[PDB]
């Protein structure tokens, strides 16, 4: 296992100036001819010429049109092509090769592969080496001249980077297309698409230069009518980057292409973005509401890669520089487009659940790691989502005006993470009106792993009208740093007058730079309730040390969506932790009788208050009636007994339900007209995020009412199944799990879903997530009847991943759930190591569970590690997760 270190970076001893590709696609094989116009760099020390090349079948290789001989002049071990230095020229030379690859049987979905009837490429991060020989690293900038040939019937549409400069016929029913892309680019931004694609098109005219831009969205013929929303999102993305960042698209054409088989959401390439079908295609009739926010964000994300990618990555350790930034730009875009507070809330909810788990797991790493073995395991929620929060904090610190200045300085001057911090430091100096002000401490956000803990204590003096906020920050030591240093933590705060719910001070961002600090406020007429970390201004554990009474007041009257949301969350956690220990204590002591502390009555009253408030947001309401995610809860519990937590959740839901179920039912009925309005059902460009939030609320309330066995709720469930919206009649399936009509809706909703590839995958998720006692028997049914031996990641993930969130069933004390997923992981690892690693996600919290379940998970992981044919990808991941 070769380990790459960040501190060991050195520029290549070679230069690649021009790439001339000839990709000839045939029925059983794809022939790739490549001519590399190379040179010797100043960093050269007469070393061997080593190319990356994985799984390549060599027909012949040459230097200056002279064939090289195997063994005497070069060696190849299916991974590296080593050409001995004595046969390597000392000036400008040309390296040529012809290799054979097989996209048809490339089930790893990396490099060049075939998805259904579409040939597509995936080169990030180390995929280009699976297509042809190359110095496969992002700092190798080169020009590209690509020619693609194939059978005209099977692959009438040919796409690649740059301008299509020639189209020609080939004897035998074949055709060819030449693409020249003059601007320098790294090889992971190379792409090629071949297939029988249909499209929707539009013309975008830029804001300043008024350049006309051809926009194309591609898919297979069957689902071409699901491309409308993606096209609209693309238009929205371009306009936003123009309006907010003042950036225009540089090329004359942009292509979006959807494929059925894809490891992640999408990928960016210059002028040619390639999407997972579930993140590009949608229709009101064949998609749940989630697809619309999903497509918006993903289409936006890959577009925001364009302008930065056009002018500025030194090495893969700087991954968070382009990903953290893009996701940040993606999130700013989504918030502006959706105009809903739940958008920002959704991002925070994901970070504090998924990423916080990772950052306290053995897999914990900084957003810029010091080392890696597999680059495929580098693309984590830490690099992406914590990285985004780090990039977002720049905006919070600098403000909108100065941030755009710092951003413009970054784009114009350029790279590494330090380069971006430098540009922001320049804006920081301007804002602070001082050249001695710096952001050197801020770099610790890039190098320090783990989640910081921020705790508070307060003091108010009525006589002097003086309010003090004592802040403390702390990060637990891990395997990355023995000693943790204080970070630059921006704390957006407000002060709420508890008597009238008014703001007491203007916008304020506390700059915590030390381990602890005391912030004092004068002329505070009355004792305030602090509104801390507004908008979640820092990726930290917040310990407000407020009473439930104070939290309730914030929940009702604070202006900031997150602090309201977080206050409700904190009230829940306090209740959860209390009831958990009470349930646990009874279990450990085998008590015949015991007591549970009821849910705060005033808290329940506050929920009723907000719910019955017509001017309150529907999406926000859905959050406050829902307990915190299980993966968020586990961060606050040692040796988590999943059964006890399940009992705890059940009791708390029942407590609140016993009070508010009538309110829940009344709202479910009254919300129907606006939530399920069909006015624009066949207007595929009309998306109402507020309306979809109303359906989110209705479906959430229906779920609560179903679990509570509300009187005659089955009637509502049945009628809900007749709704035109997939979000509704799929919800009816899952909530009917507690009734004898589950399998009736099972067949009904299957018939509705089976003829759409993406919709069926949503049906699989719904079944997988169904709260059924016979869930293991049901999963077997999906395997034999629906899933079978499919190698489609969307199919495999849909069947198994939602099931892993079943607290009671997946964590069955027998370990049957752990054994099931482990078998799926090992099975998947044979053809797709990346997806196999994705399926390991349930095991990420293994050392946080009770001792018995720790043992069970560890055994299955050790079993997987003992598999003789385990991939390096999977091996490295499990080794790090099990601290071996
Ligand atoms: Mg091969
Ligand atoms: Mg990507
Ligand atoms: Zn990205």
Curated annotation (Swiss-Prot):
Site (Important for substrate specificity): 264
GO CC term, one of those recorded: food vacuole
Annotated positions for site Transition state stabilizer: 384
The keyword Mitochondrion appears for this protein: no
Post-translational modification, as annotated: The full length protein appears to be cleaved into a 120 kDa precursor. This precursor is then proteolytically cleaved at the N-terminus generating a 96 kDa form which is further processed at the C-terminus into 68 kDa and 35 kDa forms that remain associated.
pH dependence: Optimum pH is 7-7.5. Active from pH 5 to 9. Has less than 20% of normal activity at pH 6.0.
Cofactor names: Zn(2+)
EC top class named in words: hydrolase
Major subcellular site: cytoplasm
Site (Cleavage): 595-596
Extra facts: May have an additional translation initiation. Translation initiation at the first Met codon would generate a form that contains the signal peptide, enters the endomembrane system, and ultimately reaches the food vacuole. Initiation of translation at an internal Met codon would result in a form that lacks the signal peptide, thereby re-directing the protein to the cytosol. A nuclear localization signal would then lead to nuclear import.
Protein name in the entry: Aminopeptidase N
């Amino acid at each position: 296992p070769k380990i790459h270190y960040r501190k060991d970076y050195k520029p290549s001893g070679f230069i690649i100036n021009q790439v001339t590709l000839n990709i000839n696609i045939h029925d059983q094989e794809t022939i790739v001819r490549s001519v590399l116009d190379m040179d010797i760099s100043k960093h050269n020390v007469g070393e061997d010429l080593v190319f990356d090349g994985v799984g390549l079948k060599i027909n012949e290789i040459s230097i200056n049109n002279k064939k090289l001989v195997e063994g005497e002049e070069y060696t190849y071990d299916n991974e590296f092509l080593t050409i001995f230095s004595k046969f390597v020229p000392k000036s400008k030379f040309a390296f040529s090769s012809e290799v054979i690859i097989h996209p048809e049987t490339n089930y790893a979905l990396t490099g060049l592969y075939k998805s259904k009837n579409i040939i597509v490429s995936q080169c990030e991060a180390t995929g280009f080496r699976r297509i042809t020989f190359f110095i496969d690293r992002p700092d190798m900038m080169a020009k590209y001249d690509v020619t693609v040939t194939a059978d005209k019937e099977k692959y009438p549409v040919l796409l690649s980077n740059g301008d299509k400069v020639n189209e020609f016929e080939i004897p035998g029913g074949r055709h060819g297309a030449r693409f020249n892309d003059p601007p320098l680019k790294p090889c992971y931004l190379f792409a090629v698409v071949a297939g029988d694609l249909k499209h929707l098109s539009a013309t975008y005219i830029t804001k300043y230069t008024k350049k006309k831009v051809e926009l194309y969205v591609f898919s297979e013929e069957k689902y071409v009518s699901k491309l409308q929303w993606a096209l609209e999102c693309l238009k929205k993305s371009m306009a936003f980057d123009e309006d907010y960042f003042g950036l225009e698209y540089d090329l004359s054409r942009l292509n979006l292409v959807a494929v059925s088989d894809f490891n992640v959401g999408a990928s960016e390439n210059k002028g040619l973005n390639i999407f997972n079908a579930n993140s590009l295609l949608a229709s009101k009739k064949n998609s749940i509401d989630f697809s619309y926010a999903r497509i918006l964000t993903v289409v936006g994300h890959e577009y925001f890669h364009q302008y930065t990618g056009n002018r500025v990555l030194r090495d893969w350790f700087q991954l968070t520089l382009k990903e953290g930034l893009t996701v940040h730009r993606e999130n700013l875009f989504s918030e502006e487009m959706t105009k809903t507070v739940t958008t920002r809330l959704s991002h925070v909810d994901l970070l504090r659940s998924v990423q916080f788990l990772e950052d306290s797991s053995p897999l914990s790493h900084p957003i810029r790691p010091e080392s890696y073995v597999s680059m495929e395991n580098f693309y984590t929620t830490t690099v992406y989502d914590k990285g985004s929060e780090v990039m977002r904090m720049y905006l919070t610190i600098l403000g909108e005006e100065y941030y755009k200045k710092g951003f413009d300085i970054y784009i114009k001057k350029n790279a590494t993470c330090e380069d971006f911090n430098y540009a922001m430091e320049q804006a920081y100096k301007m804002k602070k009106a001082d050249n001695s002000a710096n952001l050197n401490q801020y770099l610790l956000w890039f190098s320090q792993s783990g989640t910081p803990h921020v705790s508070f204590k307060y003091n108010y003096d009525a006589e002097k009208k003086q309010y003090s906020i004592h802040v403390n920050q702390y990060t637990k030591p891990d395997e990355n740093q023995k000693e943790k240093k204080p970070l630059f933590i921006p704390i957006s705060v407000g002060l709420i007058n508890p008597e009238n719910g008014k703001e007491m001070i203007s916008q304020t961002t506390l700059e915590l730079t030390k381990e602890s600090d005391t912030f004092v406020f004068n002329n505070i007429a009355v004792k305030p309730i602090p509104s801390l970390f507004r908008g979640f201004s820092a990726p930290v554990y917040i310990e407000d040390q407020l009473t439930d009474e104070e939290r309730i007041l914030l929940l009702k009257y604070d202006s900031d969506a997150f602090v309201r949301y977080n206050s409700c969350t904190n009230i829940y956690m306090k209740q959860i932790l209390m009831n958990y220990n009470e349930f646990l204590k009874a279990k450990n002591e085998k008590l015949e009788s015991f007591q549970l502390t009821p849910v705060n009555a005033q808290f329940i009253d506050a929920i009723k208050y907000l719910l019955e408030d017509p001017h309150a947001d529907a999406g926000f309401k859905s959050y406050i009636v829902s307990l915190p995610q299980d993966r968020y809860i586990i961060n606050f519990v040692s040796n988590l007994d999943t059964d006890v937590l399940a009992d705890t959740k059940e009791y708390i839901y029942k407590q609140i339900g016993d009070k508010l179920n009538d309110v829940y039912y009344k709202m479910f009925k009254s919300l129907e007209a606006k939530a399920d309005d069909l006015t624009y059902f066949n207007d595929e460009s009309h998306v109402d995020f507020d309306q979809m939030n109303m359906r989110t609320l209705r479906n959430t309330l229906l779920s609560l009412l179903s679990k509570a066995q509300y009187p005659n709720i089955l009637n509502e469930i049945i009628e809900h199944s007749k709704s035109p919206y997939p979000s509704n009649w799929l919800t009816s399936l899952s909530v009917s799990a507690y009734f004898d009509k589950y399998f009736e809706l099972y067949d009904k909703t299957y018939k509705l879903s089976k003829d759409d590839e993406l919709l069926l995958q949503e049906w699989l998720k719904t079944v997988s997530r169904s709260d059924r006692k016979d869930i293991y028997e049901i999963l077997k049914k999906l395997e034999n009847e629906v899933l079978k031996d499919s190698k489609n990641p969307n199919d495999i993930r849909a069947v198994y991943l939602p099931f892993t969130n079943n607290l009671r069933r997946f964590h069955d004390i027998s370990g049957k759930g752990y054994k099931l997923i482990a078998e799926v992981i090992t099975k998947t690892d044979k053809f797709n190591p990346m997806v196999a690693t994705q399926l390991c996600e349930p095991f990420k919290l293994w050392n946080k569970l009770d001792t018995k379940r720790q043992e069970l998970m560890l055994n299955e992981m050790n079993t997987m590690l003992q598999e003789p044919q385990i991939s390096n990808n999977l091996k490295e991941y499990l080794l790090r997760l099990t601290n071996k």
